[PDB]
Design a protein around this ligand. Structure first.
Ligand SMILES: NC(=O)[C@@H]1O[C@H](CO)[C@@H](O)[C@H](O)[C@@H]1S[C@@H]1O[C@H](CO)[C@H](O)[C@H](O)[C@H]1O
Ligand SMILES: [Mg+2]
Ligand SMILES: [Mg+2]
Ligand SMILES: [Mg+2]
Length: 138
């Protein structure tokens, strides 16, 4: 597989119709997963499943600009389970990232960072065995 944390270059950043696919398996007794779509030091799209925040499972999304986190967007639908294989698909659409897990739509996150073609790396981290991470234009 791949060594976590893993950096996936996104050559020429992202653009609508670009689909990024992350395949792995959650470790037993997981605490967190994180995808970080970065524009340089900024994080355009942070997607952060938390397995135990006050004994609740929640996905936190956010953007970091000039080292400051913005307003979190939170989703209680939580498709991940400790120990189980998952697929995350992030499809760039004109106004948002659209995320589906295991072929089921999960959430969308409106673009706050506008220079899509400068979001040139995806960091993948957390309590997973990572199998593959790739992109394709659809
Ligand atoms: N920025 C913080 O330190 C906030 O701390 C609060 C109390 O622990 C939490 O309720 C907030 O979610 C964040 S934690 C911080 O969140 C950002 C996303 O907004 C990112 O997930 C960071 O890795 C995490 O430390
Ligand atoms: Mg279409
Ligand atoms: Mg923000
Ligand atoms: Mg911008």
């Amino acid at each position: 597989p791949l060594i976590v944390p893993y950096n996936l270059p996104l050559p020429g950043g992202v653009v609508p119709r670009m689909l990024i696919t992350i395949l792995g398996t959650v470790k037993p007794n997981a605490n967190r997963i994180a995808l970080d779509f970065q524009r340089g030091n900024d994080v355009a799209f942070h997607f952060n499943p938390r397995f135990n925040e006050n004994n609740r499972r929640v996905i936190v999304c956010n953007t970091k600009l000039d080292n400051n986190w913005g307003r979190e967007e939170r989703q209680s639908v939580f498709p991940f389970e400790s120990g189980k294989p998952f697929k995350i698909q992030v499809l760039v659409e004109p106004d948002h990232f659209k995320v589906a897990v295991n072929d089921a739509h999960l959430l969308q996150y409106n673009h706050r960072v506008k220079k899509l073609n400068e979001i040139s790396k995806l960091g993948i981290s957390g309590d997973i065995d990572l199998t593959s991470a790739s992109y394709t234009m659809i």
